Amino acid sequence: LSRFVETLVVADDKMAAFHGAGLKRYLLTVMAAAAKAFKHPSIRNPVSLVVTRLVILEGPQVGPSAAQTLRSFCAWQRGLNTPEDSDPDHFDTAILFTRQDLCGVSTCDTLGMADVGTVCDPARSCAIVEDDGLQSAFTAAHELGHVFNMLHDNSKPCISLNGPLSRHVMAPVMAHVDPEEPWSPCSARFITDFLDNGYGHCLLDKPEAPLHLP
Ligand SMILES: O=C1NC(=O)[C@](CNC(=O)c2cc3cc(Cl)ccc3o2)(c2nccs2)N1
Numbered sequence: 001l002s003r004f005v006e007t008l009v010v011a012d013d014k015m016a017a018f019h020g021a022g023l024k025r026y027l028l029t030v031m032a033a034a035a036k037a038f039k040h041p042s043i044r045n046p047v048s049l050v051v052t053r054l055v056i057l058e059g060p061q062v063g064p065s066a067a068q069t070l071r072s073f074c075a076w077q078r079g080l081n082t083p084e085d086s087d088p089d090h091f092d093t094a095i096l097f098t099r100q101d102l103c104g105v106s107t108c109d110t111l112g113m114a115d116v117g118t119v120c121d122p123a124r125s126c127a128i129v130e131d132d133g134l135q136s137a138f139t140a141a142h143e144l145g146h147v148f149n150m151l152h153d154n155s156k157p158c159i160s161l162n163g164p165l166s167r168h169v170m171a172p173v174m175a176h177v178d179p180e181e182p183w184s185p186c187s188a189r190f191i192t193d194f195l196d197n198g199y200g201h202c203l204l205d206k207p208e209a210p211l212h213l214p
Pocket residue numbers: 066103104109110111112113114138139142143146168169170171172173174175177
């Protein structure tokens with residue numbers, strides 16, 4: 001029942017250049033806020049996002065293309081992991097924060113990208129986030145929602161699960177998130193199905209040494 005995502009957090013050289021000595025505290029603050037969203041009852045099946053490893057940056061190729069940056073990061077992070085979840089150095093997902101302005105095919109409006117429904121596949125359990133300096137925890141929550149198999153709330157399946165009456169984490173673009181319902185019914189259904197179907201089998205072990213905000 002209790003689920004734990006052992007998370008590797010990675011910050012690129014641009015993050016280090018900007019945030020400097022306060023970077024570690026900043027990343028843990030961002031991740032604490034994302035973790036709070038994943039415990040909210042609206043998600044139906046809460047999970048504990050636990051930072052277990054923190055890397056401040058050869059490394060991954062970071063550039064304008066969100067797609068290519070994600071692929072490069074996901075290839076790179078594989079090398080840091082271990083084969084077995086029982087090894088304390090093993091992690092369940094990897095998230096990169098960058099100051100790079102990430103882009104799609106026609107615009108640079110995107111703030112992140114992730115593989116969908118990949119949380120317990122070490123080869124694919126990856127997300128990237130463009131650090132905007134204020135709302136990065138919401139972007140991280142959106143990308144981790146995708147990692148947990150969530151769709152956007154304007155997708156056809158979500159229409160039928162959400163009802164007729166853009167205020168949630170899995171909105172297709174960032175808008176003001178409802179504090180009483182960060183996750184739509186569609187998001188709750190998709191993460192619940194995902195875990196019920198056995199795709200969260202790597203989330204059952206408790207981490208030994210979480211990184212805590214002191
Ligand atoms: O993860 C992604 N889904 C996408 O459609 C997008 C763009 N959206 C965001 O960056 C983004 C961040 C965010 C935060 C909240 Cl609270 C709600 C919605 C949000 O959307 C891409 N477009 C093209 C390639 S990737 N990235």
